Amino acid sequence: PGRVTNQLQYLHKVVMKALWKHQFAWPFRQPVDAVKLGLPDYHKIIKQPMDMGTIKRRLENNYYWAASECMQDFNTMFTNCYIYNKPTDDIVLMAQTLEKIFLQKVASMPQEEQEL
Amino acid sequence: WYSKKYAKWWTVYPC
Known part of the structure; x- marks a missing residue:
């Protein structure tokens, strides 16, 4: 149920490229490897792991329907940390x-989302 | 392995 939109392409080709x-x-x-890092409480505190490798793959594979979904994964990553x-x-x-x-980078994103 | 507290000790992924 994924799409290519202008904003998702921008988040891929401008934002993720920079980050x-x-x-x-x-x-x-x-993903955080809590075993390797010795953080047995990590997954007890963080119930929705997220990382830029996962986001990048979702962008590449047109997993998202809308830029807000990608924005939400970025916010989950940062807040998790x-x-x-x-x-x-x-x-x-x-x-x-x-x-x-x-x-x-997001500040220069097109303000209106349209499929391509 | 790396330390979250001292993560900046590492310049790259240390694995």
Whole structure:
């Protein structure tokens, strides 16, 4: 039930392009491995894991029907990091840096969504 | 493995 829209193509070709290459992207390109990291409480706190590797694949595979779905996955990723981790943890500053770039890129997105 | 608290110690995915 997926579509290609102008906003989803923008989120793929402009927003994700910028975030995927960023120096702080590496913890977020793939799901958190709570076993490997030794975080037995991770999945007790985070009930909807999300990462940029999953988002990127959904964009590539036209999984989304509408840009809001992709925006929601980005918000889940960032909030998940802020909820699980502590405010002074490095990972949170990395996530906030990525969120700043996300927001700056989204600010130039077409304001109206249309299928292509 | 990496530390969430000290994540910036690592420049790339350490696995």
